[PDB]
Design a binder for this molecule. Sequence first.
Ligand code: HEM
Ligand code: HEM
Ligand code: HEM
Ligand code: HEM
Ligand SMILES: [Fe+2]
Ligand SMILES: [Fe+2]
Ligand SMILES: [Fe+2]
Ligand SMILES: [Fe+2]
Ligand SMILES: [Fe+2]
Ligand SMILES: [Fe+2]
Ligand SMILES: [Fe+2]
Ligand SMILES: [Fe+2]
Ligand SMILES: [Fe+2]
Ligand SMILES: [Fe+2]
Ligand SMILES: [Fe+2]
Ligand SMILES: [Fe+2]
Ligand SMILES: [Fe+2]
Ligand SMILES: [Fe+2]
Ligand SMILES: [Fe+2]
Ligand SMILES: [Fe+2]
Ligand SMILES: [Fe+2]
Ligand SMILES: [Fe+2]
Ligand SMILES: [Fe+2]
Ligand SMILES: [Fe+2]
Ligand SMILES: [Fe+2]
Ligand SMILES: [Fe+2]
Ligand SMILES: [Fe+2]
Ligand SMILES: [Fe+2]
Ligand SMILES: [Fe+2]
Ligand SMILES: [Fe+2]
Ligand SMILES: [Fe+2]
Ligand SMILES: [Fe+2]
Ligand SMILES: [Fe+2]
Ligand SMILES: [Fe+2]
Ligand SMILES: [Fe+2]
Ligand SMILES: [Fe+2]
Ligand SMILES: [Fe+2]
Ligand SMILES: [Fe+2]
Ligand SMILES: [Fe+2]
Ligand SMILES: [Fe+2]
Ligand SMILES: [Fe+2]
Ligand SMILES: [Fe+2]
Ligand SMILES: [Fe+2]
Ligand SMILES: [Fe+2]
Ligand SMILES: [Fe+2]
Ligand SMILES: [Fe+2]
Ligand SMILES: [Fe+2]
Ligand SMILES: [K+]
Ligand SMILES: [K+]
Lengths: 156, 156, 156, 156, 156, 156, 156
Amino acid sequence: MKGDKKVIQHLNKILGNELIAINQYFLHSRMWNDWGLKRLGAHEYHESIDEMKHADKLIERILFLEGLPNLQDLGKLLIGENTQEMLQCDLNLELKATKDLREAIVHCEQVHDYVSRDLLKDILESEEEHIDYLETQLGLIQKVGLENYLQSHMHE
Amino acid sequence: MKGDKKVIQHLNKILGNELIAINQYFLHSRMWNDWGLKRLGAHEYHESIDEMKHADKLIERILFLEGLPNLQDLGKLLIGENTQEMLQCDLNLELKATKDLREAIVHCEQVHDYVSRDLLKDILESEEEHIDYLETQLGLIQKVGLENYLQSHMHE
Amino acid sequence: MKGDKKVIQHLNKILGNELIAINQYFLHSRMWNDWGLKRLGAHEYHESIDEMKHADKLIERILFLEGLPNLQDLGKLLIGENTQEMLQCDLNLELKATKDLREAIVHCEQVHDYVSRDLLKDILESEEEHIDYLETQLGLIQKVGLENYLQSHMHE
Amino acid sequence: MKGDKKVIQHLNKILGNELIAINQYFLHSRMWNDWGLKRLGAHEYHESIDEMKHADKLIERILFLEGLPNLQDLGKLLIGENTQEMLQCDLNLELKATKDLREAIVHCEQVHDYVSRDLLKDILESEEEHIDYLETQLGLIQKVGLENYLQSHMHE
Amino acid sequence: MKGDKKVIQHLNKILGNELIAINQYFLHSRMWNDWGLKRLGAHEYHESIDEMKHADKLIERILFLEGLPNLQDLGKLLIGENTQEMLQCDLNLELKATKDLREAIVHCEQVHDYVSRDLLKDILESEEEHIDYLETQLGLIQKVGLENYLQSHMHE
Amino acid sequence: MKGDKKVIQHLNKILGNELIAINQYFLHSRMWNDWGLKRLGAHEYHESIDEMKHADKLIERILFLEGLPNLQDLGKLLIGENTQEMLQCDLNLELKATKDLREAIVHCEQVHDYVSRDLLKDILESEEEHIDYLETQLGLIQKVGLENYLQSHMHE
Amino acid sequence: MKGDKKVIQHLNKILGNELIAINQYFLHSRMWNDWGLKRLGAHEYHESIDEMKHADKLIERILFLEGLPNLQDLGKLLIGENTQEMLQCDLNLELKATKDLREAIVHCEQVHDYVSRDLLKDILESEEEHIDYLETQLGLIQKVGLENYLQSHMHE
Ligand code: HEM
Ligand code: HEM
Ligand code: HEM
Ligand code: HEM
Ligand SMILES: [Fe+2]
Ligand SMILES: [Fe+2]
Ligand SMILES: [Fe+2]
Ligand SMILES: [Fe+2]
Ligand SMILES: [Fe+2]
Ligand SMILES: [Fe+2]
Ligand SMILES: [Fe+2]
Ligand SMILES: [Fe+2]
Ligand SMILES: [Fe+2]
Ligand SMILES: [Fe+2]
Ligand SMILES: [Fe+2]
Ligand SMILES: [Fe+2]
Ligand SMILES: [Fe+2]
Ligand SMILES: [Fe+2]
Ligand SMILES: [Fe+2]
Ligand SMILES: [Fe+2]
Ligand SMILES: [Fe+2]
Ligand SMILES: [Fe+2]
Ligand SMILES: [Fe+2]
Ligand SMILES: [Fe+2]
Ligand SMILES: [Fe+2]
Ligand SMILES: [Fe+2]
Ligand SMILES: [Fe+2]
Ligand SMILES: [Fe+2]
Ligand SMILES: [Fe+2]
Ligand SMILES: [Fe+2]
Ligand SMILES: [Fe+2]
Ligand SMILES: [Fe+2]
Ligand SMILES: [Fe+2]
Ligand SMILES: [Fe+2]
Ligand SMILES: [Fe+2]
Ligand SMILES: [Fe+2]
Ligand SMILES: [Fe+2]
Ligand SMILES: [Fe+2]
Ligand SMILES: [Fe+2]
Ligand SMILES: [Fe+2]
Ligand SMILES: [Fe+2]
Ligand SMILES: [Fe+2]
Ligand SMILES: [Fe+2]
Ligand SMILES: [Fe+2]
Ligand SMILES: [Fe+2]
Ligand SMILES: [Fe+2]
Ligand SMILES: [Fe+2]
Ligand SMILES: [K+]
Ligand SMILES: [K+]
């Protein structure tokens, strides 16, 4: 199905954010595992899988709209150096990514690509779940203190 | 365990090839799916999961040796335009990556990092399977013809 | 609950498209079964059932909005004479019908009938799947050849 | 049980044919597997196992009849270089070998070794099955064409 | 994948040892069974099957490296006349064969064929287990006496 | 099978390290259980069992190679008097042991005792997992504090 | 609970005997397995595990009584070089150990450490079962002869 060319540019920009998240979150997962924080590591692993599934859906939509998925260009990864930096780096990636999802949805609606909009709203639903998780961990660290927070995420 | 710095560079070089292969085979898988060659698509999908698992093991080894895994740098993806070309792009990438594996196994052996050698050998075993899959598909295309070959890979 | 008269006219227009498709896909399904192309016949039968379910949901929404569903006017059936034409005829109806879905969705949004919009988007999601199935078969005919394509769809 | 010295010699001649077939069919099996014709490789593998069981039964009868099984002397393996040649090589081996089985059955009759006759009759029953399979494949290559024939034996 | 010609010769040389061992051990096994030493016969059958599996893996690897497997040239079978002689002949063969396995491993390492080296290492692990079994039987014959040793292996 | 005399001396040296580890870790497990740190006690008991399995495999190998396992000469146990030091005592033992594993792997490689190298490489694989566990616990003590770390390991 | 200093010294003396027994019996079990006397090997492995359980219970008791388990000072292992002598080596070790158990039971009784007496009496119960097993095997060697006795313990 010939799809709108700016829609496809948008889809490819969102795809570009997923591929950053995939790699960013996977490395965070394995850093946590390596430091003995296996509960943070497991959860972060599943975040990474969600982003992999976002990427898949975008790639499949782009191809169906007869565009060319771009897996070549990869933005800056925000790799933190400690647990609090790492959650904040994820948050900042998410908030940026939702900005771009909103503008892409706006464009889909102008052009009447309601299916692409439905796809992008479903991803948006999921990134707002991620943001809620990230904000809440940053909040808990304040409430229970960093030492207690890490202790509670040592063991699954 | 403080690892040998050049061993870690080598591991990061291998990882860089895994990252190329992940994206390349994942896109090839989805192209085949989008064209209705679902059986090619499923097989290429599992090859990408395999490279995801290679990348995972490399990342965990680098962190154990106290290096920094590099997911930022992504080499060139060779995306073909038809089935013979996609298989040959995968083959070229695999053959190039076994060269890097062999040079890195040599160096692990020189510095007595036998466990890293074991991981690289197991990865190498899996890449020689991939090479065998790809060379065999290219051969079957010559023997049965491209149209029959694709016919046999439409339905899963 | 009293609906916007123009939303109801749109809904009746979409219904008119569904009723064409129902009869066209069902007749195509049975032509393919009669020619011994049973795997095409089975899939076309299921597409026909999908259109019946679209029609059903539209009829129910129209009665809820206190309009009169129009099952009396039946537009033009596009019956093909061979596999390639039948696929193309269906694809032509689907693209015609998706244009009417997008204009009816615009109107639903202008008058704030968001439940009718939800329904029409769900139907549109499924037509874009139908279009993908149909584009893809026509692409497979090109790639594997017509005789092979038909061979692969003789048997369930 | 002291067995007839020439019966024992006939049993070692059949044994020698079996040992040729074991190696010949097992190499053909693995060549077909290595080319991606797994349905031909698997069938040929089962033929090789049949030949192993023949050999086993002959070895056991020879030793019962107080002879010395000869596993030392190996005739010429006929190794084709493509599917048609491989099949014909196997058919040639089966035909030469039935001739030798008939001669041993004749001699077993004349000296009243009816139990060795029964064993050889059973092996011959199996060689005629192998012959029927080989001739039928070579005939199918004619009837459906070689590309199709190989297409139909890529997959299990 | 085109492999080192001299590695392939080494594999073919290991393969030639396997083919000796297969025949030598199958015959010894059937000899013990005919003499009513069924437990010796059963164990020796399983060693012969091991050698078959070794030969299989070597054939498949030669063919992937694009060499030609040599199943034609069968070396000297060393066949005993009594239990003590037969065990000692197997042992002589295993020790010769592991000398060739070590020389072939050395060569794989020199040319970086690490996967062939893993295969050979796995075969050698199994040959050392065979040597252990054989030296230990010859040991037990000395400790329990020949008649007791044979008595203990009449029944399975 | 007569083994190389220096290989056996090396295997006895590795074995002396295992015997130190068994005792040190077993006592450490029972100190922690006695202090009510059952989660540390239990994991340390399993570390001790791993060393018992290493000792076992080395003894079996030495005997196969016709050497004498030396279980008589017990090196210095490092028993701390508090949790952090006991973790550090175990880490220094592991780091000295791997020194000796690598030296011994190098000698097996020179004299072509590849099966012994395999066994030693597997043990090494397992000592690096031990080193990783120990390094990480000392790391968590800093990240979460000594009292939380102990708290987290009171209860199974 | 502060324990009596001589009781703890006695428990450490018993413990030193257990540690000798663990090693002597474990090596004996692995010599017999290596000679193909698996029924002796296996039973001796379980004797060794019994001593490991005795060592365990004594360590736990010493720690409860706030002493230091001495696992460092390993007495003389009696390793024979043949089956009869190994049985006799184990019997002399057991007979010397019970000497020390009785002396220690007497001291627990004088200082009213009744729970320690219980533990020591249970171990004693178990050493007399060991003495009974060992005495009986040396008796059967005379009654049935060395070669039959060994024959009977080749196979599980
Ligand atoms: C373009 C990038 C990627 C895409 C589109 C992608 C896609 C996927 C998908 C769809 C799955 C299966 C999810 C499921 O059904 O639960 C998966 C699994 C997985 N991926 Fe990725 N992935 C990508 C990159 C990566 C990277 C960079 C890594 C590691 C650094 C990775 C590691 C994994 C792992 C470990 C699994 C689990 C495999 C299993 O289930 O056994 N992936 N990926
Ligand atoms: C106003 C037009 C139609 C409507 C609204 C309609 C609706 C439906 C619905 C809702 C179903 C149930 C589907 C399921 O969930 O399994 C159904 C089944 C079916 N329809 Fe239709 N239909 C229409 C016209 C037709 C026509 C014209 C044909 C064939 C000439 C047809 C043939 C069938 C068949 C064979 C089934 C399956 C029967 C079964 O369930 O055993 N329908 N229809
Ligand atoms: C004297 C020559 C041989 C004899 C008498 C022989 C005999 C046998 C027998 C009796 C079996 C068990 C059949 C069954 O009941 O399933 C067997 C299995 C097998 N043989 Fe042979 N064989 C011979 C040569 C070979 C050779 C030369 C190869 C390979 C190059 C080979 C490969 C195999 C394999 C792979 C199996 C299957 C083993 C398994 O169960 O995984 N054999 N053989
Ligand atoms: C030469 C030294 C030793 C060797 C080779 C050895 C070997 C073994 C082996 C192979 C096992 C069973 C492993 C399994 O399959 O689960 C075992 C079990 C055990 N060992 Fe040792 N061991 C040694 C010394 C010790 C010592 C010194 C102690 C205590 C102070 C000890 C305490 C235990 C315990 C409690 C078990 C658990 C028994 C079971 O449930 O199977 N061991 N040993
Ligand atoms: Fe996402
Ligand atoms: Fe498409
Ligand atoms: Fe835009
Ligand atoms: Fe949706
Ligand atoms: Fe996200
Ligand atoms: Fe890889
Ligand atoms: Fe670490
Ligand atoms: Fe290097
Ligand atoms: Fe490994
Ligand atoms: Fe690969
Ligand atoms: Fe295939
Ligand atoms: Fe008809
Ligand atoms: Fe529809
Ligand atoms: Fe109503
Ligand atoms: Fe309108
Ligand atoms: Fe809805
Ligand atoms: Fe439709
Ligand atoms: Fe289809
Ligand atoms: Fe046969
Ligand atoms: Fe007989
Ligand atoms: Fe019969
Ligand atoms: Fe045959
Ligand atoms: Fe067939
Ligand atoms: Fe072998
Ligand atoms: Fe090949
Ligand atoms: Fe060489
Ligand atoms: Fe291997
Ligand atoms: Fe062997
Ligand atoms: Fe019997
Ligand atoms: Fe160890
Ligand atoms: Fe031995
Ligand atoms: Fe050395
Ligand atoms: Fe191993
Ligand atoms: Fe360790
Ligand atoms: Fe823990
Ligand atoms: Fe508690
Ligand atoms: Fe004891
Ligand atoms: Fe206490
Ligand atoms: Fe006393
Ligand atoms: Fe008691
Ligand atoms: Fe005892
Ligand atoms: Fe017994
Ligand atoms: Fe036995
Ligand atoms: K706390
Ligand atoms: K065809």
